[PDB]
Amino acid sequence: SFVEMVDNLRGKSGQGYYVEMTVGSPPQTLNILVDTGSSNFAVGAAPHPFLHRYYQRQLSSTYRDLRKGVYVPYTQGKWEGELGTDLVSIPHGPNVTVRANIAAITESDKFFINGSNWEGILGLAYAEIARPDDSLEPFFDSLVKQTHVPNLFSLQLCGASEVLASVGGSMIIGGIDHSLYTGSLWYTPIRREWYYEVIIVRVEINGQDLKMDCKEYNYDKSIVDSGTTNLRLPKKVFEAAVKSIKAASSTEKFPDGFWLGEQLVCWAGTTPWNIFPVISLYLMGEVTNQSFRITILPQQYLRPVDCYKFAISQSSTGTVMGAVIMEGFYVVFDRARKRIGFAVSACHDEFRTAAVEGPFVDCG
Numbered sequence: 001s002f003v004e005m006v007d008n009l010r011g012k013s014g015q016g017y018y019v020e021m022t023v024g025s026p027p028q029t030l031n032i033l034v035d036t037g038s039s040n041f042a043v044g045a046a047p048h049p050f051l052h053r054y055y056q057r058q059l060s061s062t063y064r065d066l067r068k069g070v071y072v073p074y075t076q077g078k079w080e081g082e083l084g085t086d087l088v089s090i091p092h093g094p095n096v097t098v099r100a101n102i103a104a105i106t107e108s109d110k111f112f113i114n115g116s117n118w119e120g121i122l123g124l125a126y127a128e129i130a131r132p133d134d135s136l137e138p139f140f141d142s143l144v145k146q147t148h149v150p151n152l153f154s155l156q157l158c159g160a161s162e163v164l165a166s167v168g169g170s171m172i173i174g175g176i177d178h179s180l181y182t183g184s185l186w187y188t189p190i191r192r193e194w195y196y197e198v199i200i201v202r203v204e205i206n207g208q209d210l211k212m213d214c215k216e217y218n219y220d221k222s223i224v225d226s227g228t229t230n231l232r233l234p235k236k237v238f239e240a241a242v243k244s245i246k247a248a249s250s251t252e253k254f255p256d257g258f259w260l261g262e263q264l265v266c267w268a269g270t271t272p273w274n275i276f277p278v279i280s281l282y283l284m285g286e287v288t289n290q291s292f293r294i295t296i297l298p299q300q301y302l303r304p305v306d307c308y309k310f311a312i313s314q315s316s317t318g319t320v321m322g323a324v325i326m327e328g329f330y331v332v333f334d335r336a337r338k339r340i341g342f343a344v345s346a347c348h349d350e351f352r353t354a355a356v357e358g359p360f361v362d363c364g
């Protein structure tokens with residue numbers, strides 16, 4: 001009920017956000033990672049060391065084989081499965097049940113994470129990048145086609161023995177829950193419908209323009225992906241960023257392992273938040289020379305591990321606006337209007353606030 005959908009996501013810091021879902025008949029319960037950076041509905045369907053629970057096609061009276069496998073390799077692992085179809089529901093989402101394609105994973109390589117608690121993955125991006133090809137209708141596409149839920153979904157990623165801290169959030173499917181944000185919603189166009197691709201026109205490491213040709217901010221592409229933790233930047237922008245960040249926090253000093261994202265830096269509640277600057281990402285607006293900025297605090301790019309890890313890393317796939325950027329913002333994936341809206345979140349110190357400000361006046 002939007003209301004029924006509030007706080008329907010759980011996660012372990014840095015390990016993603018999942019939503020409970022059910023598959024088959026009787027309903028099999030599973031936690032599924034919400035990924036706007038992929039397009040397959042893939043779930044474990046065979047025993048695994050990190051899996052304490054998986055999809056059993058055998059118990060589903062409504063399961064249907066497609067006889068057609070799916071092999072998906074990547075630099076580090078893979079997941080192989082058998083393609084199928086079955087009934088799927090989201091208990092704390094819309095009150096509907098649709099028949100969707102399901103990639104039943106039977107063999108994997110560094111796919112599943114130890115102790116994350118999700119058993120599958122919900123690829124929420126377009127068919128362009130779906131495996132094995134674009135003929136395998138992504139889950140959301142089946143949802144809208146069958147039920148008559150509106151082509152749009154929102155994500156309010158929130159953030160925060162010893163254990164990784166637990167995170168919470170909401171995935172409101174079919175609409176916009178106005179109590180999840182304050183201020184107005186600024187939309188940036190979806191450049192192309194494959195990944196949720198957008199355009200960054202300018203960047204600032206607190207007031208200072210990085211002054212690069214904007215094509216660099218999107219060198220290759222720029223995407224909004226909940227399935228990625230860190231804010232990943234093209235090598236050139238990345239180094240320009242760290243330099244600026246190191247120059248502003250210098251009244252403090254740390255090792256390279258820290259900036260290379262592979263090392264923590266701890267202080268308790270003494271944390272020097274204010275030495276670290278805010279990062280402003282201006283996104284192309286709906287009107288050609290109009291843009292708007294989303295400003296993020298160190299509380300965002302310094303992920304807790306008191307200890308923290310630098311949540312900004314280098315990339316050769318382009319820019320990736322991951323969880324650490326989406327947090328503190330209510331993000332709207334308006335597939336119907338082909339755009340993405342940003343607004344300060346209900347989720348979210350007394351000197352600086354994350355912000356969504358506009359407007360401002362060849363980047364892709």
Ligand SMILES: N=C(N)NC(=O)Cn1c(-c2ccccc2)ccc1-c1ccccc1
Pocket residue numbers: 016033035036037038039040072074111112121123129130131225226227228
């Ligand atoms: N980068 C993304 N947005 N999405 C993926 O990489 C999805 N993905 C994939 C994947 C690769 C190609 C096509 C469909 C899914 C393999 C492993 C993951 C994964 C698993 C757990 C946590 C994070 C990623």
